[PDB]
Amino acid sequence: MLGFNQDEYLTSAREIIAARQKAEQVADEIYQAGFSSLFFASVGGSLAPMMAINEFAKELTTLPVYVEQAAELIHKGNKRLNKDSVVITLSKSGDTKESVAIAEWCKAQGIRVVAITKNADSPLAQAATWHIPMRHKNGVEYEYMLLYWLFFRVLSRNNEFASYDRFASQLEILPANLLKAKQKFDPQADAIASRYHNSDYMMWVGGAEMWGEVYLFSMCILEEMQWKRTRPVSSAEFFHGALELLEKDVPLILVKGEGKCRALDERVERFASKITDNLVVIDPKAYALDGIDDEFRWIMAPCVVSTLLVDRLAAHFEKYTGHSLDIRRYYRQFDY
Amino acid sequence: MLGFNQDEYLTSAREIIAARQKAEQVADEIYQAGFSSLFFASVGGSLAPMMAINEFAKELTTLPVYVEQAAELIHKGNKRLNKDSVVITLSKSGDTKESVAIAEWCKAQGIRVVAITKNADSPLAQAATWHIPMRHKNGVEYEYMLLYWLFFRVLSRNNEFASYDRFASQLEILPANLLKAKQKFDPQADAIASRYHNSDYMMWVGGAEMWGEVYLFSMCILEEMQWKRTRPVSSAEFFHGALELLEKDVPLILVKGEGKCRALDERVERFASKITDNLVVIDPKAYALDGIDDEFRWIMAPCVVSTLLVDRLAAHFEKYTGHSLDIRRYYRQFDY
Numbered sequence: 001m002l003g004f005n006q007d008e009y010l011t012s013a014r015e016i017i018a019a020r021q022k023a024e025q026v027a028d029e030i031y032q033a034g035f036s037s038l039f040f041a042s043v044g045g046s047l048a049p050m051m052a053i054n055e056f057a058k059e060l061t062t063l064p065v066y067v068e069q070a071a072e073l074i075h076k077g078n079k080r081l082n083k084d085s086v087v088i089t090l091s092k093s094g095d096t097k098e099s100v101a102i103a104e105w106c107k108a109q110g111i112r113v114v115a116i117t118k119n120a121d122s123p124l125a126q127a128a129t130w131h132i133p134m135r136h137k138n139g140v141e142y143e144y145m146l147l148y149w150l151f152f153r154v155l156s157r158n159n160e161f162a163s164y165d166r167f168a169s170q171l172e173i174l175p176a177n178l179l180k181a182k183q184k185f186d187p188q189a190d191a192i193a194s195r196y197h198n199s200d201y202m203m204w205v206g207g208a209e210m211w212g213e214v215y216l217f218s219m220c221i222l223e224e225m226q227w228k229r230t231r232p233v234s235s236a237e238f239f240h241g242a243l244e245l246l247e248k249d250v251p252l253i254l255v256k257g258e259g260k261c262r263a264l265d266e267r268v269e270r271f272a273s274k275i276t277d278n279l280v281v282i283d284p285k286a287y288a289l290d291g292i293d294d295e296f297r298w299i300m301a302p303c304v305v306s307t308l309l310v311d312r313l314a315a316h317f318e319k320y321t322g323h324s325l326d327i328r329r330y331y332r333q334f335d336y
Numbered sequence: 337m338l339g340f341n342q343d344e345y346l347t348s349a350r351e352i353i354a355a356r357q358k359a360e361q362v363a364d365e366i367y368q369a370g371f372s373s374l375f376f377a378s379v380g381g382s383l384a385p386m387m388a389i390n391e392f393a394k395e396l397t398t399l400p401v402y403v404e405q406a407a408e409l410i411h412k413g414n415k416r417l418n419k420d421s422v423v424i425t426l427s428k429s430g431d432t433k434e435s436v437a438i439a440e441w442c443k444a445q446g447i448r449v450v451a452i453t454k455n456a457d458s459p460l461a462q463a464a465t466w467h468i469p470m471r472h473k474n475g476v477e478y479e480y481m482l483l484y485w486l487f488f489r490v491l492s493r494n495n496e497f498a499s500y501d502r503f504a505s506q507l508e509i510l511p512a513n514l515l516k517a518k519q520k521f522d523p524q525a526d527a528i529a530s531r532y533h534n535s536d537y538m539m540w541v542g543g544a545e546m547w548g549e550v551y552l553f554s555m556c557i558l559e560e561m562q563w564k565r566t567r568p569v570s571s572a573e574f575f576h577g578a579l580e581l582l583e584k585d586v587p588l589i590l591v592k593g594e595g596k597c598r599a600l601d602e603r604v605e606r607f608a609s610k611i612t613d614n615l616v617v618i619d620p621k622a623y624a625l626d627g628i629d630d631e632f633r634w635i636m637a638p639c640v641v642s643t644l645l646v647d648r649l650a651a652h653f654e655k656y657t658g659h660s661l662d663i664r665r666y667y668r669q670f671d672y
Contacts, residue, residue, distance in 0.1 A: 001429045044576030055412075062415050064400070071572040072544055075596045076391075079398050201537070201565060208408055219569075224577030230539060231567060233555075236407040240380030241560030242665050271672045330579050336607045 001186050003315030004070040006179065012136035019133050020168070026114060026130040027153030035112075036084035037064035040072050040147075043098045045220040046090050048212030049144040052302045052336050053151050055209040059260075061160050070098040074105050080109065088150070090134070090143060094105065094122025103127035116146050122168070134201035137191075140216065140310050141178060141303040145171055148299070170292045174300060178307040181287040185308045192280055193316035199251050200229065203242070204254035206270050207234035213302050215253050217309045225325040226317050234262040243271065251278040255305055258285055261299035282308065337522050339651030342515065348472035349511035355469050356485050356504070362450060362466040363489030371448075372420035373400035374490070376483075379434045381556040382426050383606050384548030385480040388638045391545040392454040395596075398497050406434040410441050417447065421475050423588065424486070426470070426479060430458025439463035452482050476552065476646050477514060477639040481507055484635070499631065506628045510636060512587055514643040517623040521644045528589075529652035535587050536565065539578070541604050542591035543570035549638050550591050553645045561661040562653050571600040587614040591641055594621055594635035618644065 040050035050067045057065040064080060070089070073081075081087070087106045091099045094117040103113045104127045115128035118135055125131045132150065136142040149168060156164035184323070194200060202222070206214040218232040228283060233242045235254075246252060252272045258264040271278045284304035289297060318325050376386035386403045393401040400416060406425070409417075417423070423442045427435045430453040439449045440463045451464035454471055461467045461480045468486065472478040486503060492500035532538060539557070542550040547570060554568040569578045571592075582588060588608045592601040620640035625633060653660050666672070 005592070037641075044573065052394070057411055058414050058416075062417065069570070069572050071600060072570075072597055075600060076395055076544065077596075078394050079396065080394075120558075169632040176630045199622065208412065219573070227580055229567065229581060234405070234408075236405050237380065237555070239667075239672075241555040241667070243563060244560045244563055244664065246666075260413075261408055263406060263409060267672070271666075274672075328580065331575075331577070336575075336603070336610075 001182065001312070001315075002319060004182065004311065008137050009139065009179060012139055012142060014300070016137035016142045016145055017172050019146060020172070023132050023146055023149035024153045024168070026132055027150050028157065029130065030086050030112075030114075031154055031157035034084065035086045036082055037066065037075070037080050039068055039078070039081055039085055039087045040064050040238070041068045041070040041087055041099070041102050041240060042090055043070050043096065045140065045216045046092075046096075046099075046143065048140065048216040049147050049302070050088075050090075051212040051215070052144065052209045053147055055211070056151075056299060061155055061158065063158060065156075070102040072103050074098070085108050086112045088116070088147075089124060089128070090116040090147070091122075091124050092118070092134070094119050094124045097125070100124050100127065114150070116143070116150075138311065140306040143175070144303050144306070145174065163293075166293060167296055167299075170296060173291045174289070174303060177287075177289045177292065178303065180309055182312055183305055184287065186312050188314045189308070189312040191317075192313060193320050196251050197279075197317055198319035201250065202228065202230050203234045203246065203250060203252040204230050204255070205235055205238055205252060205265075206257070207236055207264060208257055208261035209259055209298065209302055210255050210257040210265075210305065213305045213309065216306075217313075221314050221325075222317070224328070224331060225314065226321055226323055228317075232317070235261065235268045238268050239271075246272060246275045248275070248277050250276050251280065252276050253280040253282060256281065256283040257298065258301040266320060337518065337648070337651075338655060340518065340647065343451060344473050345475065345515060346511070348475055351441065351471035352478045352481055353508050355471070355482060356508070357480055359468050359485035360489045360504070362468055363467065363486050366422050366448075366450075367490055367493035370416055370420065371422045373402065373416050375402050375404055375409070375414070375417055375421055375423045377404045377406040377423055377435070377438050378426055379406050379432065380437075381476065381552045382432075382479065384476065384485050384552040385638070386424075386426075387548040387551070388545045389483055391547070392487075393633060397491055397494065398545065399490075399494060406438040410434070410438050419446050422448045422450060424483075425451070425464070426452040426483070427458075427459060427460050428454070428470070430455050432460070434533075435464065436460050450486070452479070452613045463611065474647065476642040477510070480639050480642070481510065489498055499629075502629060503632055503635075509627045510625070510639060511659060512622075513625045513628065514639065517640055518648055520623065522648050525644070525648040525652045526655075528649060528657050532587050532614075532616075533653055533656035537586065537629075538564065538566050539582065539586060539588040540566050540568045540591070541571055541574055541588060541601075543572055543600060544592070544593055544597035545595055545634065545638055546591050546593040546601075546641065549641045550647065552642075557650050557660060557661075558653070560664070560667060561631075561650065562657055562659055565651075571597065571604045574604050575607075582608060582611045584611070584613050586612050587616065588612050589616040589618060592617065592619040592621070594637040
């Protein structure tokens with residue numbers, strides 16, 4: 001497939017599955033020591049999986065769980081962040097300034113920190129209590145998986161996730177299913193990109209546990225890496241003003257969930273189908289997850305969508321725009 | 337001033353100030369009875385003030401305080417929303433479907449509800465434990481004020497807001513200061529609208545306690561009421577991909593705060609001034625708040641910005657677009 005190497009992808013899966021044990025050990029140490037609140041703090045694309053965690057937490061736990069933009073958090077402080085909190089950070093490079101900053105800030109206050117990053121000698125890990133190795137090359141799904149073993153193991157220990165053992169083992173067969181999903185979607189990825197690569201404006205709609213997917217793809221891929229103008233908006237909030245912008249020629253790409261807010265997504269689908277000639281539906285329910293219990297599909301869904309968009313759809317956009325995904329005109333190009 | 341009636345504005349202020357006592361009484365009854373968590377649940381523009389409350393709560397209280405989109409909340413439920421919670425709702429009409437729905441859902445479960453709305457016989461108030469009359473004509477600042485007396489009175493009772501008595505009395509002189517701010521800004525409102533009313537795309541940037549202002553103005557005024565395409569993005573997150581879209585000819589309107597995240601806004605200001613010829617800065621620090629202690633300016637700031645944008649800037653956009661702010665092509669025009 002264009003812009004894909006199966007060996008690299010399966011190497012990534014093996015490396016992340018090899019970190020399951022460490023993620024579970026960190027979870028167990030956090031639970032056994034005790035904690036007040038869990039703060040998932042990051043910036044940019046690494047927030048997406050954390051916003052999915054927050055959405056799962058809303059339903060599944062009474063524990064205090066928060067997701068925070070790390071620059072806002074270090075400026076404001078937070079009255080619920082205290083010496084018994086655990087702050088979870090994640091950075092592909094291990095150097096991301098805002099993540100290193102919050103980890104160092106916590107360390108100076110005696111607040112425990114998890115660093116999910118490749119190297120134990122990174123600035124992020126050097127500021128942390130625990131390190132979970134994160135050794136994939138490509139795929140935001142692998143960020144989700146490490147966060148899932150960590151978070152859902154805490155919930156299991158807290159008597160709030162009786163299905164953990166099945167979930168955690170089945171999560172290991174997610175990558176093999178994602179590879180199949182990539183193959184199924186690749187032609188549609190090409191069709192979408194062929195049709196919309198020169199669009200002046202695209203509306204991107206989703207929500208709840210899917211919001212992170214929309215948030216990341218729109219800003220971190222389309223805007224940052226293709227210079228395409230987007231309007232990301234939640235399914236629920238679409239009907240409270242953004243809907244007025246939709247018209248026959250306006251692309252709207254709807255990312256659907258498999259949880260309890262799927263009905264909110266379907267409302268958008270029904271409206272858009274009447275108003276625009278340019279509706280694209282990205283529905284993870286179209287993709288099999290063989291060997292995975294259907295009760296876990298709502299949790300897996302953001303990973304399914306990520307593997308389609310961040311990989312396949314990005315590669316096909318790049319094909320038609322002729323704009324390398326690695327170009328930046330400002331980001332990290334000068335001091336600001 | 338164009339599209340403004342001072343008598344209506346001052347009548348609104350008198351009506352809202354006359355509801356201070358009731359807001360305080362509701363706060364006192366909530367505190368005296370006890371509660372677990374406070375959930376501020378709404379949709380669309382009425383979320384803005386609630387998102388400011390959440391941002392203040394992050395710094396000022398250890399109480400469990402959450403802001404939720406009411407449609408998402410009723411679909412998902414929430415494990416932290418229990419029989420001792422209080423759910424706060426707010427609707428100008430008293431009929432807003434999602435707000436009435438959550439209030440009725442709570443009522444059926446024995447969960448207490450505050451309804452902030454004009455009429456005691458509205459569906460929203462009929463589903464509620466407490467009613468705070470909200471009788472202004474125009475001005476989102478008046479939504480903020482009622483929420484402020486309610487929330488900050490709870491914090492005072494909870495030993496977390498020692499300055500309450502001064503704050504609550506000084507809040508009564510906010511409208512008189514806002515009227516002066518309107519007069520000061522009106523010419524600039526005209527200049528901004530003259531320059532940008534035919535813009536194909538505008539970036540709108542702010543954050544933390546100011547995010548609601550950006551969120552509301554962009555979607556609920558510009559998109560919904562002028563059919564203008566916007567990209568609202570937080571100051572902190574602007575630097576994690578959206579920045580790549582900025583160029584010489586792209587309008588960026590920066591709404592600044594007066595709290596601890598003002599530095600995040602200033603980073604955007606410095607970057608944008610180098611990249612676009614079309615930077616507009618909306619800074620509430622330019623506006624006097626006479627008779628209000630400077631320690632409260634960060635709390636008042638979202639109201640200052642609202643009084644400028646939602647009123648004056650909207651009126652001047654309407655002048656130049658020739659598109660009545662009351663036009664809708666879809667919203668509430670057919671069944672969806």
